Write an enzyme that holds these catalytic residues in place. Structure first.
Site, mmCIF file in Angstrom:
data_model
loop_
_atom_site.group_PDB
_atom_site.id
_atom_site.type_symbol
_atom_site.label_atom_id
_atom_site.label_comp_id
_atom_site.label_asym_id
_atom_site.label_seq_id
_atom_site.Cartn_x
_atom_site.Cartn_y
_atom_site.Cartn_z
ATOM 1 N N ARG A 1 15.679 -15.250 -28.379
ATOM 2 C CA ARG A 1 16.831 -16.044 -28.812
ATOM 3 C C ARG A 1 16.734 -16.400 -30.293
ATOM 4 N NH1 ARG A 1 18.414 -20.664 -30.239
ATOM 5 N NH2 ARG A 1 20.449 -21.565 -29.698
ATOM 6 N N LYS B 1 42.409 -36.378 -33.212
ATOM 7 C CA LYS B 1 43.594 -35.756 -33.791
ATOM 8 C C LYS B 1 44.905 -36.266 -33.207
ATOM 9 C CE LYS B 1 41.725 -31.526 -35.814
ATOM 10 N NZ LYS B 1 40.388 -31.179 -35.257
ATOM 11 N N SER C 1 0.823 -1.214 0.000
ATOM 12 C CA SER C 1 0.000 0.000 0.000
ATOM 13 C C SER C 1 0.853 1.259 0.000
ATOM 14 C CB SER C 1 -0.968 0.001 1.182
ATOM 15 O OG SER C 1 -2.058 -0.878 0.948
ATOM 16 N N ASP D 1 2.366 1.540 -3.504
ATOM 17 C CA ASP D 1 1.348 2.031 -4.416
ATOM 18 C C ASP D 1 0.973 3.490 -4.162
ATOM 19 O OD1 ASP D 1 -0.390 1.213 -6.756
ATOM 20 O OD2 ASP D 1 -1.801 2.209 -5.374
ATOM 21 N N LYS E 1 17.241 -25.529 -13.792
ATOM 22 C CA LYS E 1 16.933 -25.215 -15.186
ATOM 23 C C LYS E 1 15.486 -24.830 -15.269
ATOM 24 C CE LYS E 1 17.570 -26.306 -20.041
ATOM 25 N NZ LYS E 1 17.263 -27.261 -21.135
ATOM 26 N N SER F 1 23.312 -22.843 -27.503
ATOM 27 C CA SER F 1 22.422 -23.868 -26.962
ATOM 28 C C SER F 1 23.134 -24.508 -25.759
ATOM 29 C CB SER F 1 22.131 -24.918 -28.038
ATOM 30 O OG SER F 1 21.228 -25.917 -27.588
HETATM 31 C C1 LIG Z 1 -1.391 -2.894 -4.828
HETATM 32 C C2 LIG Z 1 -0.057 -3.567 -5.052
HETATM 33 C C3 LIG Z 1 1.114 -2.831 -5.105
HETATM 34 C C4 LIG Z 1 2.345 -3.450 -5.214
HETATM 35 C C5 LIG Z 1 2.443 -4.840 -5.261
HETATM 36 C C6 LIG Z 1 3.788 -5.530 -5.293
HETATM 37 N N1 LIG Z 1 4.953 -4.646 -5.104
HETATM 38 C C7 LIG Z 1 5.307 -4.240 -3.832
HETATM 39 C C8 LIG Z 1 6.415 -3.478 -3.601
HETATM 40 C C9 LIG Z 1 6.725 -3.153 -2.178
HETATM 41 N N2 LIG Z 1 5.965 -3.667 -1.217
HETATM 42 O O1 LIG Z 1 7.674 -2.413 -1.910
HETATM 43 C C10 LIG Z 1 7.208 -3.097 -4.740
HETATM 44 C C11 LIG Z 1 6.876 -3.488 -5.991
HETATM 45 C C12 LIG Z 1 5.714 -4.301 -6.242
HETATM 46 O O2 LIG Z 1 5.394 -4.729 -7.351
HETATM 47 C C13 LIG Z 1 1.264 -5.610 -5.229
HETATM 48 C C14 LIG Z 1 1.284 -7.117 -5.184
HETATM 49 C C15 LIG Z 1 0.040 -4.949 -5.145
HETATM 50 C C1 LIG Z 2 18.031 -21.264 -22.039
HETATM 51 O O1 LIG Z 2 19.400 -21.675 -22.041
HETATM 52 C C2 LIG Z 2 20.088 -21.634 -20.862
HETATM 53 C C3 LIG Z 2 19.509 -21.669 -19.610
HETATM 54 C C4 LIG Z 2 20.291 -21.543 -18.471
HETATM 55 C C5 LIG Z 2 21.655 -21.348 -18.564
HETATM 56 O O2 LIG Z 2 22.408 -21.204 -17.445
HETATM 57 C C6 LIG Z 2 22.265 -21.213 -19.841
HETATM 58 N N1 LIG Z 2 23.616 -21.074 -19.916
HETATM 59 C C7 LIG Z 2 24.167 -21.014 -21.113
HETATM 60 C C8 LIG Z 2 25.653 -20.827 -21.173
HETATM 61 C C9 LIG Z 2 23.362 -21.142 -22.307
HETATM 62 C C10 LIG Z 2 23.966 -21.084 -23.678
HETATM 63 N N2 LIG Z 2 22.058 -21.324 -22.229
HETATM 64 C C11 LIG Z 2 21.486 -21.376 -20.988
#
Ligand SMILES: Cc1ccc(Cn2cc(C(N)=O)ccc2=O)c(C)c1
Ligand SMILES: COc1ccc(O)c2nc(C)c(C)nc12
Ligand SMILES: Cc1ccc(Cn2cc(C(N)=O)ccc2=O)c(C)c1
Ligand SMILES: COc1ccc(O)c2nc(C)c(C)nc12
Lengths: 318, 318
Positions: A137, A315, A33, A36, A116, A81
């Protein structure tokens, strides 16, 4: 100097600080709040005094006019990749191959281990601190201009959090949609007759391909930065983890579950610890991305172009 | 029917048979003087009766008018790169990685082992038996039209040696210059003031980039086919060696030193046998190219795109 240009600058600085704390640190100093209150205090004033409105202000995340088709972007540094392993024995063989391929194997072989995400790979440019260009990408060589769509992501900074940002810094990351956002979205599509999404990966991809940022704004997307591309005007650390720690300190979101593991035995412990945590993360994960932490060893080993797994050129020496 | 159209067809068939024996089999049935007698007997007659001259006749290897720049060619099927090993322990790790990555590991794991020529990668198309298009590897996706330069290579057939050739067959191979040809060339450049070539690889590359086929004709170049691209109108064998044996039987040059080795222990024996033969081959070799012989296992394993050797995505099971 005027009191209103002083008020605007103060509000902008505070709101960015509150956003860093909420999104990147997961530790807001104030209630939503309060955040906001100041948000629309700023917005109202920028509109009462248009001459002092900036393009990187926290209130200008959404472009009012929808786009008419994406433009192509040739990546300067290519987006590569990733290789994949499907077992403990397969992972250990990849390590043994590196152990020999290196000129000198250090006693502790440290790896930066991370989850991942099942997300969409993007490249975000920051010129002298402010966000100027974002792109998908694609094939790796070419992608598409998703700048107005990346700008809408609440956790992506429009301005880096530093007084001396680099000349050009390309942040590389994965866009994804968490479970809560994904469940909330499908309820809304069901309550207001529209297509639902199969899984979080497809919802995020579909939200990024929108040509009207106002739709993207409503989609609960999130960024997690995994690497760096262009790096002008800065001396990046000599380890991957520290470069990640560095992005965290200048305002970029990075995954908190990232850890350093010394050797395959510890790395397998991490892979197992994340495999059990799968059930309580709040977002999807296909596996774990494991990397050689030392950047010198990364540049020693190098890359491998589009090539078979069923062939090798053994090689001869000199 | 006429006696001269009968004579031309007979000479063409004989001369191609003599060329197969000399170049591909290394076993000519007749002396070079006999081959040449008939060569200019054909040439004289085609010129005395122009109406019966064909574009794929053994006398039409060289285009009389020099070219004015090469044209770009987008490869239909991509031309991939090769992975490399630098030790016995590094090669064995690559095998162990395949051993696990496979669903079922056969008791004898057969490999088609061959010497690695230090040559230039090309793609040659044959439409209904006759040579229509040749192109360089380039980046893999795009290359250049070296058709008139490939046509001049004495050991490359202008017409496949079969009554039922396939619809379209792309022969993939390496152009190189043997030692004798390379030594003879540098003596000629020295005796007639011109640049000499450093090593056979550079002489071949420089000869292929000539826009006047008459220069290429004088350069002692040679082809050795390593794989196949487009394959319409034919059921190619289910092993790599047999596909190679098949190219040998339809008129294409293939390396005689190619052997089958069962498992890493035998493969290392081959690598060692070729390492000692280096001293008596008559052409340069960087190493050995080793391949999984079974094509099903090749399609099971697959490829890997431009990607780091220092990173891996160890995925989770279902
Ligand atoms: C109404 C409203 C305002 C803000 C947010 C989320 N939020 C909060 C802050 C905070 N607390 O410092 C900072 C950035 C942000 O995105 C929500 C979920 C809803
Ligand atoms: C979506 O592909 C990835 C996801 C997360 C990684 O740390 C990656 N790290 C590298 C080095 C590369 C080429 N791709 C990545
Ligand atoms: C004068 C001359 C003619 C031919 C050749 C080589 N050669 C021989 C045959 C052959 N023996 O069946 C077939 C093709 C060919 O290229 C040389 C070296 C010199
Ligand atoms: C010049 O590159 C090569 C040389 C020899 C081979 O057997 C090759 N085999 C394959 C499969 C590929 C992609 N390249 C090869």
């Amino acid at each position: 100097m005027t009191n209103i240009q002083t008020q605007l600058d103060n509000l902008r600085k505070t709101l960015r600080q509150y956003e860093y704390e909420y999104h990147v640190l997961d530790n807001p100093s104030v209630p939503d709040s309060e955040y906001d209150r100041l948000f629309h205090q700023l917005k109202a004033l920028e509109l009462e005094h248009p001459e002092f409105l900036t393009s990187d202000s926290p209130t200008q995340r959404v472009g009012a006019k929808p786009l008419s088709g994406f433009s192509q972007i040739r990546h300067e540094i290519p987006m590569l990749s990733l290789d994949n392993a499907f077992s403990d024995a397969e992972f250990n063989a990849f390590v043994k191959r590196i152990e020999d391929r290196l000129i000198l194997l250090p006693k502790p072989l440290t790896f930066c281990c991370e989850p991942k995400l099942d997300g969409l790979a993007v490249s975000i440019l920051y010129v002298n601190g402010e966000l100027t260009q974002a792109a998908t990408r694609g094939d790796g060589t070419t992608g598409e201009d998703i700048t107005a769509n990346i700008r809408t992501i609440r956790n992506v900074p429009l301005q880096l959090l530093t007084d001396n940002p680099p000349a050009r810094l390309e942040v590389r990351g994965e866009v994804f949609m968490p479970h809560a956002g994904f469940e909330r979205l499908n309820k809304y599509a069901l309550e207001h007759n529209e297509k639902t999404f199969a899984n979080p990966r497809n919802a995020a991809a579909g939200s990024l391909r929108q040509l009207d940022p106002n739709i993207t704004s409503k989609r609960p997307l999130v960024l997690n930065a995994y690497g760096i591309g262009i790096a002008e005007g800065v001396d990046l650390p000599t380890t991957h983890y520290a470069r990640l720690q560095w992005l965290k300190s200048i305002g970029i979101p990075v995954n908190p579950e990232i850890r350093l593991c010394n050797g395959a035995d510890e790395v397998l412990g991490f892979y197992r610890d994340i495999q059990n945590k799968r059930s309580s993360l709040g977002y999807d994960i296909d596996g774990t991305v494991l990397k050689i932490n030392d950047i010198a060893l990364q540049n020693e080993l190098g890359f491998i172009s589009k090539a078979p797994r069923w062939a090798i050129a053994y090689k001869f020496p000199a």
